[PDB]
Coordinates of C-alpha atoms in Angstrom, one line a residue:
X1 CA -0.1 8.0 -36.7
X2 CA -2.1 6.3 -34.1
X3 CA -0.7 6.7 -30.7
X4 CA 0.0 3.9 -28.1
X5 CA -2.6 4.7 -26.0
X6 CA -5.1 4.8 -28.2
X7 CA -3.7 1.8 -30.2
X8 CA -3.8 -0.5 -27.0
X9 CA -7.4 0.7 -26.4
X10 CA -8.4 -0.2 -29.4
X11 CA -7.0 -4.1 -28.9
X12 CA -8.4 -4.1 -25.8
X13 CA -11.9 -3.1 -26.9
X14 CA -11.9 -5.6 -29.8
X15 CA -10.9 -8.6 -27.5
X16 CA -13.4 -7.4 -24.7
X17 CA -16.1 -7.7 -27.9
X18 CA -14.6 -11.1 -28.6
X19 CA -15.5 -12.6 -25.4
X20 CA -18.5 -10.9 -25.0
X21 CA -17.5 -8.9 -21.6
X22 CA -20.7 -6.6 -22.3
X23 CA -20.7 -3.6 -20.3
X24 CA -17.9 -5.1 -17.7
X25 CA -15.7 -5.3 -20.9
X26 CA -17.0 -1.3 -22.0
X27 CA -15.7 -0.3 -18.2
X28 CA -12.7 -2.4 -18.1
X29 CA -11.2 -0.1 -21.6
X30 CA -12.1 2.8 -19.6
X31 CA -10.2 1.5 -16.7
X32 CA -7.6 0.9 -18.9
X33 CA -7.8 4.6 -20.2
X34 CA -7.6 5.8 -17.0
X35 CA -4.2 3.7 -16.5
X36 CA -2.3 4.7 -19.7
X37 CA -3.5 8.3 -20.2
X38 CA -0.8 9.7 -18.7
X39 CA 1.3 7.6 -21.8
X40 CA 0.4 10.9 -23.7
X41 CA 0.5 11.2 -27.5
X42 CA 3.3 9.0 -27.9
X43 CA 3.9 7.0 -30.8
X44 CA 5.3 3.2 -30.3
X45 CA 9.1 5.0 -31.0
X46 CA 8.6 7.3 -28.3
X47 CA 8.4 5.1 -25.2
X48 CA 11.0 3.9 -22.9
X49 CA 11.2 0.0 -23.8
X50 CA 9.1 -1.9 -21.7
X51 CA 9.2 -5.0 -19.1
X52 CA 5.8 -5.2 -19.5
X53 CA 7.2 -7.9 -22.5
X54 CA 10.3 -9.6 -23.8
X55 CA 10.1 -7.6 -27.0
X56 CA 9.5 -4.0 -25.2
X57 CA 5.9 -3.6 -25.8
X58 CA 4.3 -1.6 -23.0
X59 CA 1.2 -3.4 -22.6
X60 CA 0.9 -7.6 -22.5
X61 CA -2.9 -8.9 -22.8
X62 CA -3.9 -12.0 -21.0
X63 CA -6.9 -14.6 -21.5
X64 CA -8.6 -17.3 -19.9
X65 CA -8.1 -20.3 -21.8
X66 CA -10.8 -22.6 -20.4
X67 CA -14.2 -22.2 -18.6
X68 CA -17.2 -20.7 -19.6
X69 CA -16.5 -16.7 -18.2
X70 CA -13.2 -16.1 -19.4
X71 CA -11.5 -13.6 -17.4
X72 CA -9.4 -11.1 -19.4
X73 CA -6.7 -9.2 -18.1
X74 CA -3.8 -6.4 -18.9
X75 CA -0.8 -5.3 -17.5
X76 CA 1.2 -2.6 -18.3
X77 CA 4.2 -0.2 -17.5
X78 CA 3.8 3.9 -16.1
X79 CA 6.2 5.5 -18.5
X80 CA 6.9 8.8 -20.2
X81 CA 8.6 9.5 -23.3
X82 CA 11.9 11.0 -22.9
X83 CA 11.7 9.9 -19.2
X84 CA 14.1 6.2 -18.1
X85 CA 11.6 3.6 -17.0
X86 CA 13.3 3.4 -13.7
X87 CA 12.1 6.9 -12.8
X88 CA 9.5 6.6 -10.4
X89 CA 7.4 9.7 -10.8
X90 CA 4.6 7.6 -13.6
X91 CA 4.1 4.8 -11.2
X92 CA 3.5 6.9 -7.8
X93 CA 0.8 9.1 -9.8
X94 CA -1.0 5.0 -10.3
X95 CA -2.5 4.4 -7.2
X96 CA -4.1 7.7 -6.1
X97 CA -5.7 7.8 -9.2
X98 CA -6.8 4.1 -9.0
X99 CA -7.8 4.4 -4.9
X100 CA -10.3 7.9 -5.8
X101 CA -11.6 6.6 -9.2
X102 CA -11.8 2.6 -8.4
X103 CA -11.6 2.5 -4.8
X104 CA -8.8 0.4 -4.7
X105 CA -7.3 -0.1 -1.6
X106 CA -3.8 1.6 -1.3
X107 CA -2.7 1.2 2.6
X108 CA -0.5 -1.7 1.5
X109 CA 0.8 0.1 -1.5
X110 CA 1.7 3.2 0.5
X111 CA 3.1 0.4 2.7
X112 CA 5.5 -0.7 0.4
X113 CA 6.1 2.0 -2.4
X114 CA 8.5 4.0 0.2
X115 CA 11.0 1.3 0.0
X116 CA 10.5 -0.5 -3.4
X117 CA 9.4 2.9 -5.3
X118 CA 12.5 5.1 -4.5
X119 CA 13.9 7.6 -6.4
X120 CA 17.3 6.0 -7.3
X121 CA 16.4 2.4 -8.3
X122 CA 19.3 0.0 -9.0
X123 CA 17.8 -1.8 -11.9
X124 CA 16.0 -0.9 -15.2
X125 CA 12.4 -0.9 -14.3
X126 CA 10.2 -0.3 -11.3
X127 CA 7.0 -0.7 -11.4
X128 CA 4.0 -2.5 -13.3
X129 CA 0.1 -2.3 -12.7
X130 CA -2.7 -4.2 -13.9
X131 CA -6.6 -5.3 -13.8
X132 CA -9.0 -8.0 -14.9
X133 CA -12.2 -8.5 -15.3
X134 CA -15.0 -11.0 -16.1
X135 CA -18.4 -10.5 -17.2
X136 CA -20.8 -9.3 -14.5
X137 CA -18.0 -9.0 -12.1
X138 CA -15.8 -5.7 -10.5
X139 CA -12.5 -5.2 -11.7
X140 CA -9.5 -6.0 -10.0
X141 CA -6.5 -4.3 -9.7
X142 CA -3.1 -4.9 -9.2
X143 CA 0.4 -3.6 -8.9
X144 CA 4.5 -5.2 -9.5
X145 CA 7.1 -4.2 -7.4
X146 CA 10.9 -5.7 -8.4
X147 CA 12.8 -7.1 -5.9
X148 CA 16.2 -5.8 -7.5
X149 CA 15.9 -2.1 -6.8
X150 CA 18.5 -2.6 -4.4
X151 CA 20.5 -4.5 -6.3
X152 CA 20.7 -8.1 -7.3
X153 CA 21.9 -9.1 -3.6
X154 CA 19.0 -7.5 -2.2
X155 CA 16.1 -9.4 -3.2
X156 CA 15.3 -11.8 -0.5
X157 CA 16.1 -8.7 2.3
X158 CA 13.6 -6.8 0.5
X159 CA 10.9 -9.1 0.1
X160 CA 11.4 -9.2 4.3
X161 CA 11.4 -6.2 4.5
X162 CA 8.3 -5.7 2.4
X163 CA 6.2 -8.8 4.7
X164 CA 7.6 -6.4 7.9
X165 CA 5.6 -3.1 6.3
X166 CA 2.8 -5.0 5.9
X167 CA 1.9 -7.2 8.9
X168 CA 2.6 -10.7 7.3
X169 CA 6.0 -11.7 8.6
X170 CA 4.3 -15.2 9.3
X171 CA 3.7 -15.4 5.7
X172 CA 8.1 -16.1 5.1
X173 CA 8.1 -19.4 6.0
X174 CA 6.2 -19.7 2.7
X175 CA 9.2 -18.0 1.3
X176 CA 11.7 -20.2 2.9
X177 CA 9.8 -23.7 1.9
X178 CA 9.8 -22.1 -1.9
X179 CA 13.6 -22.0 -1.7
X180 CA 15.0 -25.1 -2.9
X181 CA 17.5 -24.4 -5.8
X182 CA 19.4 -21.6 -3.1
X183 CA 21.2 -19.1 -5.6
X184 CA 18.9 -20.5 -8.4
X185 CA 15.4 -20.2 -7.5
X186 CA 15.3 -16.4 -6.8
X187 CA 12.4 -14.0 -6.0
X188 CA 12.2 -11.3 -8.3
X189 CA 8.7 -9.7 -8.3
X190 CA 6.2 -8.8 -5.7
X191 CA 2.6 -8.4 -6.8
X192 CA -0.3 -7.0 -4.7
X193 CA -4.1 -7.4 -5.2
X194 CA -5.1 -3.8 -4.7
X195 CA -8.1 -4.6 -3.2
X196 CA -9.8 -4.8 0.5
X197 CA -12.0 -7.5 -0.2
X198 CA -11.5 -10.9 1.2
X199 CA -9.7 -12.5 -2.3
X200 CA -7.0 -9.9 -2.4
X201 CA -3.5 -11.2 -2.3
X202 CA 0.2 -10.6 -2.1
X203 CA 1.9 -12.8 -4.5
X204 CA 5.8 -13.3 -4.8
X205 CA 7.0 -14.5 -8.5
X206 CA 10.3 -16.8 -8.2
X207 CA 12.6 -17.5 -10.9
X208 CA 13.8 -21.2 -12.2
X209 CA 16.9 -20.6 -13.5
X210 CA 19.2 -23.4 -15.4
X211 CA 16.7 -26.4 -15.0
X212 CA 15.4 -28.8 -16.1
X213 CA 11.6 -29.8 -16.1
X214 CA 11.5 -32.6 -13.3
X215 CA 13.7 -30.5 -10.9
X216 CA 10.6 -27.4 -11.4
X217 CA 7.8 -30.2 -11.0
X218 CA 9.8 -30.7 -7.5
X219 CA 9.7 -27.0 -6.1
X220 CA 5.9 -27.4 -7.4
X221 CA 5.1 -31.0 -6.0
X222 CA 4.6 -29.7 -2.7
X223 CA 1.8 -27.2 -3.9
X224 CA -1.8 -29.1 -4.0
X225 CA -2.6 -30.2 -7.1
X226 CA 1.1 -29.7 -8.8
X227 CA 1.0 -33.5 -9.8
X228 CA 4.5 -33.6 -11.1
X229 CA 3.1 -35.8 -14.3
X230 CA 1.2 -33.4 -15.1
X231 CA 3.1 -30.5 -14.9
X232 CA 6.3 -32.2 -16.4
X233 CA 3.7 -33.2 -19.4
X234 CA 2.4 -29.6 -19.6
X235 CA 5.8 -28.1 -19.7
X236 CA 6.9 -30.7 -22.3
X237 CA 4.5 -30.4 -24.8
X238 CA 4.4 -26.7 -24.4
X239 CA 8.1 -26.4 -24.5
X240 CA 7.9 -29.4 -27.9
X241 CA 9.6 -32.1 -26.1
X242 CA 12.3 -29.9 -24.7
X243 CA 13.3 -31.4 -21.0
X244 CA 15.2 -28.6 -19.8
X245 CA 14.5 -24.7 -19.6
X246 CA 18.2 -24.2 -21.4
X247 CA 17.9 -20.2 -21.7
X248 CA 14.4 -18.4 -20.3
X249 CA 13.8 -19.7 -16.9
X250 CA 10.3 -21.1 -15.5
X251 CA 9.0 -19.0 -13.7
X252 CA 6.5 -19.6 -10.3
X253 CA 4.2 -17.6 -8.6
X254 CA 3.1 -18.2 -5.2
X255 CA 0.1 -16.6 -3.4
X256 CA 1.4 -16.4 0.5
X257 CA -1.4 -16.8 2.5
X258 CA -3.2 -19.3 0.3
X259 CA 0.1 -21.8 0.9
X260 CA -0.4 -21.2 3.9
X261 CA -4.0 -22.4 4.4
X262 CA -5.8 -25.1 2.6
X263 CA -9.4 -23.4 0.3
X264 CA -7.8 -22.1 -2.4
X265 CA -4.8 -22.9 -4.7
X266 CA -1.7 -21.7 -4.2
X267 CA 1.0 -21.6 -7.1
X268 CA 1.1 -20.5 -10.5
X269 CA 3.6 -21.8 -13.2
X270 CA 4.3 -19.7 -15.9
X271 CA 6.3 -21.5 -19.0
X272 CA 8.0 -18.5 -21.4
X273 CA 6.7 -19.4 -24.8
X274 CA 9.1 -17.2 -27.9
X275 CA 12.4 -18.8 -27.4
X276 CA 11.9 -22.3 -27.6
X277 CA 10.1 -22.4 -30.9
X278 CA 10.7 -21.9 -34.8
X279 CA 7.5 -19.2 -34.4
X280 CA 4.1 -18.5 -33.5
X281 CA 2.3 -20.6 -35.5
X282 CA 4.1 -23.8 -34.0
X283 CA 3.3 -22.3 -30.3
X284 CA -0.1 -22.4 -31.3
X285 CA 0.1 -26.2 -32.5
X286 CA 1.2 -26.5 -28.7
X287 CA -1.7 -25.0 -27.7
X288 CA -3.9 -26.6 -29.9
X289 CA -2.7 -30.1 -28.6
X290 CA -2.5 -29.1 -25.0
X291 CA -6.3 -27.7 -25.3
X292 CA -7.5 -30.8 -27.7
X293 CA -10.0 -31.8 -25.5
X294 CA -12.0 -28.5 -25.4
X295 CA -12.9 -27.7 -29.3
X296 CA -14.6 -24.1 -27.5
X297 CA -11.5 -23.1 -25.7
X298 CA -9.6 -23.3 -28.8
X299 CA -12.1 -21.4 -30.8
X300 CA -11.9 -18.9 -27.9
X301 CA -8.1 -19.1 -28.2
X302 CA -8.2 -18.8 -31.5
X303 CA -10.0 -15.5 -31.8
X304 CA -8.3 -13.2 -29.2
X305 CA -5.0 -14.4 -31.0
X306 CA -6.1 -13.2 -34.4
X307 CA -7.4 -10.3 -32.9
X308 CA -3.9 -9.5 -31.3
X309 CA -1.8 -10.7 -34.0
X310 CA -0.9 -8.4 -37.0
X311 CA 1.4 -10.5 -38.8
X312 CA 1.6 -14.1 -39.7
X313 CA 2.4 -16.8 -37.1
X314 CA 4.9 -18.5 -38.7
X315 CA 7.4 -15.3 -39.5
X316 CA 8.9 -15.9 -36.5
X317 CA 8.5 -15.8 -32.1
X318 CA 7.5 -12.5 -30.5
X319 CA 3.0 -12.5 -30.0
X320 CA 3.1 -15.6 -27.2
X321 CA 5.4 -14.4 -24.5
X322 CA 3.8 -17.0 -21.6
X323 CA 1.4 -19.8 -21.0
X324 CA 0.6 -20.5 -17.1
X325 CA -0.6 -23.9 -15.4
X326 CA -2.5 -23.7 -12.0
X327 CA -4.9 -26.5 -10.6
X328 CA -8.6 -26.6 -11.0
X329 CA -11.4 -27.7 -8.8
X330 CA -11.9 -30.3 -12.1
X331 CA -9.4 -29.3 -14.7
X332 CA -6.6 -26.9 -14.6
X333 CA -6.5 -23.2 -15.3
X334 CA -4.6 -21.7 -18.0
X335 CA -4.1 -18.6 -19.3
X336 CA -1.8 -17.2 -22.3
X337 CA 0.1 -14.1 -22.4
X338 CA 0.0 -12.0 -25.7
X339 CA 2.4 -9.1 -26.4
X340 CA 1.0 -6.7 -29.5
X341 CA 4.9 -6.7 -30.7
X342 CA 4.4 -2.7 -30.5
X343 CA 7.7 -1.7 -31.7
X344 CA 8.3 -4.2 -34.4
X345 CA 8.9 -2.9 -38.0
X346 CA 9.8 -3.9 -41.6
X347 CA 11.3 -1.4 -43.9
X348 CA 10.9 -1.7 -47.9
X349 CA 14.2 -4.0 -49.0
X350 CA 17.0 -1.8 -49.3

């Protein structure tokens, strides 16, 4: 009888305790109250599927696999039962609430939402938020916007359009430099850091589709640190020897302005985890090679995972959605994706 809200709460509270957030973790589930209130007392069956994660779940948790001060992060869907997904009315009501509780900033938002927020959106889904936090520092926010709510055509005239609103046209030639695979490297999301402060960014999130691993390590190569040995090994041993993304695509991120400069790092690639494996407990073996030589990251690992799952790895795919690879200043940082499989079920045999 527990609703969604209070369900995902609850998760998020028990992980917070697991990495020992303190009181940034105590504020970060009231932050997170704050974003799925309006989720009412709905029951897993009540909600519109989400995009939030493959199997519909509404809410995807996210971890720092390495370094001392994990981060931990959520993102999740506005939605109301009984409502379609793609009705914008959950996802406007987001950012005033997060600019007057949170002071996040929403010029850029109200920049954007006109055009990727409308009332008629083409596809299925329209918008996402999210925060993170680590111990002893603010949260951040963020917000997804989907390049397809103008059609499939549409994407790269959006994303345009979008840099126009803003002020950061001189940020496309990042765009046009990402676009190798024309027709099969496509721009799907748009993510903004709804923050003021100097680290804030807008972040466009491409997909790979139909390749194989050495032709991602290429679009990549040209991002610092993207040594293409590396990357083809993480994707390898992550994917369990697979050379080629056959189904699920790769998927990149790229932070504009920071491919543009030269301080920070740039790209983010995300390698989808619950089709390419017999089931959670051999993801895990992936992860536990890939992490060998950190015995505490896997610990960590270990423990939000248990905490998340409620059903035995091996019964099949569905808890790892994604693992991610960006460069480090001495190792590289990762982070895995967890979905709570919200709506699974299993009914007594017949």
């Amino acid at each position: 009888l527990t609703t969604v809200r209070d369900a995902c709460a609850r998760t998020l509270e028990n992980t917070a305790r697991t990495l020992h957030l303190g009181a940034s973790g105590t504020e970060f589930v009231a932050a997170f109250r704050a974003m799925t209130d309006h989720w009412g007392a709905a029951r897993p069956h009540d909600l519109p599927l989400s995009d939030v994660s493959p199997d519909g779940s509404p809410v995807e948790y996210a971890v720092d696999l390495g370094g001392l001060a994990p981060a931990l992060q959520f993102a999740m869907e506005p939605l109301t039962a009984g409502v379609p997904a793609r009705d914008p009315l959950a996802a406007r009501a987001i950012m005033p609430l997060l600019a007057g509780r949170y002071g996040a900033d929403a010029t850029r938002w109200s920049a954007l939402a006109d055009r990727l927020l409308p009332d008629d959106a083409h596809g299925p889904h329209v918008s996402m938020y999210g925060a993170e936090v680590r111990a002893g520092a603010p949260i951040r926010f963020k917000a997804w916007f989907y390049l397809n709510v103008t059609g499939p055509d549409g994407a790269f005239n959006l994303l345009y359009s979008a840099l126009e609103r803003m002020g950061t046209t001189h940020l496309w030639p990042v765009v046009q430099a990402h676009v190798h695979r024309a027709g099969e490297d496509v721009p799907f999301l748009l993510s903004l850091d709804l923050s003021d402060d100097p680290a804030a960014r807008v972040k466009v999130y491409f997909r790979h589709f139909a390749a194989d691993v050495e032709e991602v390590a290429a679009v990549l190569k040209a991002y610092p640190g993207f040594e293409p040995g590396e990357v083809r090994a993480f994707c390898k041993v992550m994917m369990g020897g697979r050379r080629r993304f056959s189904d699920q695509p790769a998927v990149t991120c790229v932070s504009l302005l920071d491919a543009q400069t030269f301080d920070r790092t740039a790209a983010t690639l995300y390698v989808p985890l619950w089709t390419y494996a017999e089931h959670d407990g051999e993801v895990r073996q992936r992860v536990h090679r890939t992490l060998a030589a950190w015995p505490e990251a896997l610990y960590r690992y270990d423990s939000v995972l248990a905490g998340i799952a409620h059903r035995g790895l091996d019964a099949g795919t569905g808890i790892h959605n994604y693992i991610s690879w960006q460069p480090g200043r001495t190792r590289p940082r990762m982070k895995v994706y967890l979905s709570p499989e919200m709506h699974d079920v299993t009914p007594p045999p017949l």
